[PDB]
Amino acid sequence: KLPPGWEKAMSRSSGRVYYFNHITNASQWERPSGEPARVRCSHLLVKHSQSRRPSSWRQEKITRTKEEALELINGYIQKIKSGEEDFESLASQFSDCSSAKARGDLGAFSRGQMQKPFEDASFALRTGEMSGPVFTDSGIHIILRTE
Ligand SMILES: Cc1nc(C)c(CO)s1
């Protein structure tokens, strides 16, 4: 029927169908389009107080709750999708990962190297596609597949 991990949903506010991916947490109105040894991704990480290491170059002690980190992620996704802000610009300014300095770029990787929910979302994204909120022991990520 549909690509890996996609399913139909109903908007509660508009009543129009939409499509949701339970591996990447992406959602969109349009029916999704149409695996490689390696993919290349960038990400934007927002850490919270239960992150495996609750610190970053932005904050020595990260104190924000999981709830608060998800609200930040949600807000960044809105600005990226509206075009008010670029993914790369938001990642350089606000990502709690050292990769912020590289506009979020992580380089290329195979299966078995990254944390598993990050890995599964990365490989389920098509080239150019961006994830919804993806949760790992590091925190909450927005993932952009670039290759
Ligand atoms: C975890 C990472 N830190 C930096 C600066 C990278 C470069 O791509 S990846």
Rounded to the nearest angstrom, the distance between the alpha carbon of 25 and the centre of ligand 1 is 24
- The DSSP letter of residue 86 is -
For the chain, how many structural domains are there in total? 2
Resolution for this experimental structure (Å): 1.8
Count of other CB atoms within 10 angstroms of residue 49: 14
Ligand 1, atom 4, residue with closest C-alpha:
99
**Residue 31 Cβ contacting ligand 1 at under 6 Å:** no
Same domain (yes/no): 24, 48: no
Helix (H) or strand (E) holding 41: strand 39-46
Q: How far apart are CA 94 and CA 13, in angstroms?
A: 31
Are 12 and 45 contained in the same domain? no
Q: Which domain holds residue 123?
A: 38-147
Look up the CATH number of the domain holding residue 105.
3.10.50.40
Most ligand 1 atoms within 8 A of CB, residue of 45, 101, 136, 143 to mutate? 101
Question: Coil, helix or strand for 73?
Answer: helix
* Same domain, residue pair 77 and 116: yes
| Ligand 1 atom with least separation from CA of 98 | 3
What method was applied to determine this entry? X-ray
**Same domain for 12 and 76?**
no
Same domain? 5 vs 69: no
Angle 98-99-102 from CA coordinates, rounded to 5° = 130
